[PDB]
Amino acid sequence: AAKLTEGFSFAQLGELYVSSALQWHQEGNHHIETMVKDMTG
Amino acid sequence: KEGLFLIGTTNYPEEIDPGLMNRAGRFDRAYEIGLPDEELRLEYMKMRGFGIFLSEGEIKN
Amino acid sequence: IPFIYQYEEKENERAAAGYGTFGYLITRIEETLYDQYGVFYELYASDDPNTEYWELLVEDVRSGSLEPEHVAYIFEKLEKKTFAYDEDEKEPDYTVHKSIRNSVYAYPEKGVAFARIPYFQDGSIMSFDCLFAVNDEKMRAFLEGVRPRLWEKSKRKVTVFTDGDGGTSREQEAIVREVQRSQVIMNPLLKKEIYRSIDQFFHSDKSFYQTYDIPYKRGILLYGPPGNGKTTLVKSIAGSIDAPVAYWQITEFTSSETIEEVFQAARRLAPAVLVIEDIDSMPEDVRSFFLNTLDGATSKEGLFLIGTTNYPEEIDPGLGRFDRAYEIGLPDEELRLEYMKMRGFGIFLSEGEIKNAAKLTEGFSFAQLGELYVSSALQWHQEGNHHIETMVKDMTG
């Protein structure tokens, strides 16, 4: 995830954390690769 | 300790400070409240009371 | 555990400053009310900050009403008489009557009594306003009655709010001219429509609003090209309504603060019509806040707002946040003709001459028909001759 987050601000890595946290806490599933690719686009 | 839930309103989303948006703190989701479609207009007219003086067909019309 | 101050007070040093005079006056006011009415009045406000019903008291005394009875003077050698005359008001009142300060008054049927107790300090003469009642139920009924009395009294008046640097200035004015509905010169179809709201809001039973579940408020915008007499029209509409009328004069001092003052003061006269002329003159930094007072989450009821603008563009950017916006154009032939009979052309013209003059005044504003009237009047009053056809043709050119 460090490798895929090129061009990411610290804030964006933070917003990634909160959004990735719910999913793991909601769906038992984090889906970071899906979420980094969706947050870039 | 323990939680403010903020709700902001605007008729002019263009004049919004963009810093407000898509952060978990500050406003993390925005929703558009748009003109009602026909099904919703018909729903509004019924609860509002148009049925007092309008027939079921006059309201549909 | 030790105490620094060990001085032991004479019992004479326990006395409360000012209480010996005040408690003595209150006791005597109560003894005197008992002697005259046979009941016991109790203090309910020792220096009442409320002014509304204290102003009703003064107007009651001033106008010779039977209801408030003069019970006693407080100090033998302070004033027993006063007069309404204040040189700062527009309309002087020369009424002379018994003083309010230095007096005790009672509304004996109401069970409520008033004493304005004088005292000396820095260096003027001031007073404690003291309110008495025979029991809690009468006190409450008296308070509940204040607003309906103020309402009836303000039907008979027009209240102007002029925004200033400190705040808004309230000014009551006599209804020197009453206005019948037949004197509202206006497009008949739209006159009919507006008066449906007005008659329901002011001249009917209020049950309509509860039956259809309809907020009890309204706001209409009257717009059109300049000189179309919008202002004279709104005053004419306002004058046809059997309810207090309040005019709000936007100035360069209008802020979100004066707005709230004016609306809270009008809302005390609810139901009332609130006239707002040239709402386009208000500063652009309060306009967002202003439109919220009419439709926001905490907007209130009881007011029928009527505004006028020449720039509908700038007031209600959604043009829509007023309930309805009506265009007032220049008068067509029949309106021009109603105008001429109401303004008094029939003084010096035959009916044929009026009909004709209505016909020749195409494109005339109401103001221009007015300026025609004054100029045509002199001639008939100066030369025995009116020469309207000559004067309309000369005023167009």
> Nearest C-alpha of chain B: how many angstroms from C393?
51
d(CA C142, CA C325): 42
Q: Within 10 A of C190 (CB to CB), how many other CB atoms are there?
A: 14
- Set of chain B residues whose Cβ sits within 8 Å of the Cβ of C213: 48-49
Distances (CA, A) of C64 to C55, C68, C154, C324: 14, 9, 19, 46
Q: Measured in whole angstroms, how far is the alpha carbon of residue C263 from the centre of its chain? A: 12
Dist CA C339 CA C139 (whole Å): 52
CA C118 to CA C126: how far, in whole Å? 6
| Other Cβ atoms within 10 Å of B47 Cβ, number | 9
**Nearest-CA neighbor of C286 among C251, C320, C311, C323?**
C251
- How many CA atoms lie within 13 Å of A3's alpha carbon, on the beta-carbon side? 1
Rounded to whole angstroms, the Cα distance separating C165 from C167 reads 6
- Chains touching chain B through at least 3 C-beta pairs below 8 angstroms are A, C
Q: Is C252 exposed, middle or buried (0-12, 13-18, 19+ CB in 10 A)?
A: exposed
Which of B7, B10, B11 would best serve as a mutation to test chain C binding (most C beta carbons within 10 A)?
B11
Name the closest residue on chain A to residue B28, using Cα atoms: A15
Angle at C134 between CA C129 and CA C137, to 5 degrees: 105
B52 inside 8 A of chain C by CB: yes
Gap between the Cα atoms of C42 and C61, Å rounded: 22
Asked if C242 and C155 count as a contact pair (C-beta separation under 8 A), the reply is yes
- Give the integer Cα–Cα distance in Å for C93 and C385: 43
Which residues in chain C are contacts of B48 at CB distance < 8 A? 213
* Four-residue CA torsion sign, B38, B44, B48, B49: positive
Look at the block and give the residue holding tokens 């000189």.
Answer: C227
Residues of B in contact with A11 (CB under 8 A): 23
Report d(CA A20, CA A31) in Å as an integer: 7
**Experimental method for this entry?**
X-ray
Find the Cα–Cα–Cα–Cα dihedral C57, C61, C67, C73, rounded to 10°.
Answer: 90
Chains contacting chain A through 3 or more C-beta pairs under 8 A = B
Neighbours of C324 (CB within 10 A): 14
Q: How far is A8 from chain B (nearest CA, A)?
A: 14
Closest CA of chain B from A9, distance in Å: 13
Residue C287 C-alpha, separation from nearest chain B C-alpha, in angstroms: 14
Residue of B nearest to A19 (CA): B24
Three-state DSSP string of C107-126: ECCCCEEEEEEEEECCCCEE
Taking a C-beta distance cutoff of 8 angstroms, is the pair C32, C70 a contact? Answer: no
Distance of CA C323 to the CA centre of its chain: 24
Residue with tokens 């001033």, as numbered in its chain: C62
**Interface contact B24, partner A, CB < 8 A:** yes
Nearest-angstrom CA–CA distance, C59 and C81: 15
For this experimental structure, what is the resolution in angstroms? 2.6
Angle subtended by helix axes C366-382 and C388-396, to nearest 10: 140
Contacts of A18 in chain B (CB under 8 A): 24
Residues sharing a CB contact under 8 Å with residue C23, sequence separation 6 or more, in sequence order: none
CA B2 to chain CA centroid, Å, is 27
A and B touching (3 or more beta-carbon pairs closer than 8 Å)? yes
Q: Is A27 exposed, middle or buried (0-12, 13-18, 19+ CB in 10 A)?
A: exposed
C215 interaction partners in chain B (CB closer than 8 Å): none
Asked whether residue C27 is marked as a ligand-binding residue, the answer is no
Q: List own/partner pairs for A14-22 with CB under 8 A and 24 or more apart.
A: A14/B24, A15/A39, A15/B22, A15/B23, A15/B24, A18/B24
Question: In 10 A of CB C181, how many CB atoms?
Answer: 14
- Between chain B and chain C, how many beta carbons pairs sit less than 8 Å apart? 4
What the block records as the tokens of C367 is 């103001």
Q: Does B26 touch chain A (CB under 8 A)?
A: no
For residue B52, the chain C residues in CB contact (below 8 A) are 212
User: What span, in angstroms and rounded, lies between the C-alpha atoms of C263 and C276?
Assistant: 11
- Cβ distance C246 to C269 under 8 Å? yes
Query: Which residues are paired to C222 by β-bridges?
Result: C308, C326
Nearest CA distance, B50 vs chain C (angstrom)? 9
Residue of A nearest to B25 (CA): A15
Residue in chain A nearest B22 by alpha carbon: A15
Q: At what angle do helices C333-343 and C366-382 cross, to 10 degrees?
A: 40
CA distance to partner chain C, nearest, from residue B49 (Å): 7
Tell me the C-alpha distance between C304 and C272, whole Å: 6
* Residues in A lying within 8 Å of B, measured between beta carbons: 11, 14-15, 18
Chains contacting chain C through 3 or more C-beta pairs under 8 A? B
Q: Match 């309040």 to its residue by tokens.
A: C246
The count of residues in chain B is: 61
Question: Is C227 annotated in some ligand binding site?
Answer: yes
Which residues in chain C are contacts of B49 at CB distance < 8 A?
212-213
Q: Are C316 and C231 in contact (CB under 8 A)?
A: no
Q: Which residues pair with C112 in a beta bridge?
A: C107, C133
Is C224 a known ligand-binding residue?
yes
Rounded CA separation C161/C348 (Å) = 40
Largest CA distance in chain B: 54
CB C346 within 8 A of CB C354: yes
Of C208, C210, C213, C321, which to mutate for an interface test with B (greatest number of B Cβ within 10 Å)? C213
Cβ within 8 Å of residue C167, ≥6 positions away: C257, C258, C261
